Amino acid sequence: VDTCSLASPASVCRTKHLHLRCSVDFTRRTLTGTAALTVQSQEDNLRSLVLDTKDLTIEKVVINGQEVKYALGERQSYKGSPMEISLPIALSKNQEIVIEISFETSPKSSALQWLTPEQTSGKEHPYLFSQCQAIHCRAILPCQDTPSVKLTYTAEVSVPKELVALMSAIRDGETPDPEDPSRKIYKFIQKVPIPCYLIALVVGALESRQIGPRTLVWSEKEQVEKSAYEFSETESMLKIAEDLGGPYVWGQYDLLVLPPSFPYGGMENPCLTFVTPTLLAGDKSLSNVIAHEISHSWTGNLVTNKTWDHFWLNEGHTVYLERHICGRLFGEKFRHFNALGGWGELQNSVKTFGETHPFTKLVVDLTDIDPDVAYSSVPYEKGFALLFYLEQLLGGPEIFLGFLKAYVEKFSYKSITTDDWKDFLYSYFKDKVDVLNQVDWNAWLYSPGLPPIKPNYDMTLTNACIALSQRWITAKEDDLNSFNATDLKDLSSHQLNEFLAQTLQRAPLPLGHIKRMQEVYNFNAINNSEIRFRWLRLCIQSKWEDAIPLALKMATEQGRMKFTRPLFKDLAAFDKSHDQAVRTYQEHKASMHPVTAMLVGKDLKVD
């Protein structure tokens, strides 16, 4: 039972295919067109079915060439409004029909951000991008909006001719629009069945550059060069992910670098991963994000969580592969460094929510909860820690990766639950069930708070970071003089980041300490987004008025929620910046991503 969806569940009917024909209208900020669902009944004598929608205007519904009856129920908040459709003829089990719905979206569709020319790089053309995960697909097109259903799709998309459309699919060519020569139609085919949350569209002044045998980077012209360099390790990451997961089945692996308001670091849209431009650090240092989205091509897009209650299946196994890619690429010690940091992000989230909070459970009950409100690192790092703990328990990485590969083959193209996963783990490791029965399943899967067991981590790359952070925290005023630029001589940008996270955990420090840190380390100059983010947090929580404009500027000039949310929150909790924080949010809110706008609004207690 998918408690985030109002649609008929997969036991009743399932969508096998979507043919989308639509037109992007920048003047009205609407998508208008038809969604033709090929629907297979799962039941005898089926006479109606129910679809998810959200802020969609339905024009008509056509089956066997006739307008048919349908009704929209009362809006149920962030779930949207169910659409009941009356079939003209009862369907037997396994029978397929095609249902063609004429629809138009709202400019406030929570799946979409419409950008004015001034909000892009070029300054002449507008831009549109989608984000359907978790349950915003219903705000683009009526559908069974649940990952328990997988479908193929094909689409034809008409856009102003000087713009380009891309989707989560293989590009199938372009032509002038026969109905209007001011337009081009772009075609797309996704031959591999997918959950609808992986449906994606961008329309913009896009250009592409080739960076490996199956990868082109796409962005606006002014980001292309820099992105081709930043993401140059992409092919080699695919080669390793294929070795760990089995064949890459999706044809293409492209990258789209979005405008700065993209709400995520990355989004594993099939054939076309979307990434934040805040990845462009100039040194490839943030590439683990690519490794992570690549990994979804197996864990997530092939084997999918059946409902969002089981999200950790998606994310934990994906972080687990991500960290294996990075460990192959850079050495086992680096995998362990990133693993430990991830445990540290886990400590932060549990501390923030509170150790008994329901959202700190690995498996969560999302009835009545908006998945955007519940979203945190918990399913990522608690899930990763589980797998990392089982890895050590069952004989090491090589052995656990043999399980990961077999799990992918086993559930390829399916949607699965935590029990489906646990069963296969027991089956695969039958010769080691004795060890498996020593796991505290009830605590690991269903209890709030930190996991009951913390794995073993190599400390090698981490020590220098913990040591500098401890010098800073235990320093008194008469110790500040001994800090020098050379303290950082031997730290990678990742160690500098981990140095800041250690220190941010004990924040505030005295203002004097922070000022000296700027004096000797000149963190203000660093443009790596992760480092700068943590440094501005350390500054604002330690109450340094000079950082108020730097924090306001970062919070609004990009919209990656990981950064923009805690920055606004910190700013709001600092009395000197509180008023400018709420003022700034209120000035920017209209032209913000609607999901970010909503979440920043709640974090600020505004509206």
Ligand SMILES: CC(C)C[C@H](NC(=O)[C@@H](O)[C@H](N)Cc1ccccc1)C(=O)O
């Ligand atoms: C290395 C990763 C932790 C990077 C991370 N990206 C992801 O987790 C993506 O694969 C997720 N699919 C992002 C997501 C999750 C839920 C709803 C909407 C979007 C991010 O920060 O965006």
Ligand SMILES: Clc1ccc2[nH]ccc2c1
């Ligand atoms: Cl969307 C989403 C799905 C599953 C989850 N489990 C814990 C948080 C959470 C959020």
Ligand SMILES: [Yb+3]
């Ligand atoms: Yb073709």
Ligand SMILES: [Yb+3]
């Ligand atoms: Yb079993």
Ligand SMILES: [Yb+3]
């Ligand atoms: Yb002293």
Ligand SMILES: [Zn+2]
């Ligand atoms: Zn992910």
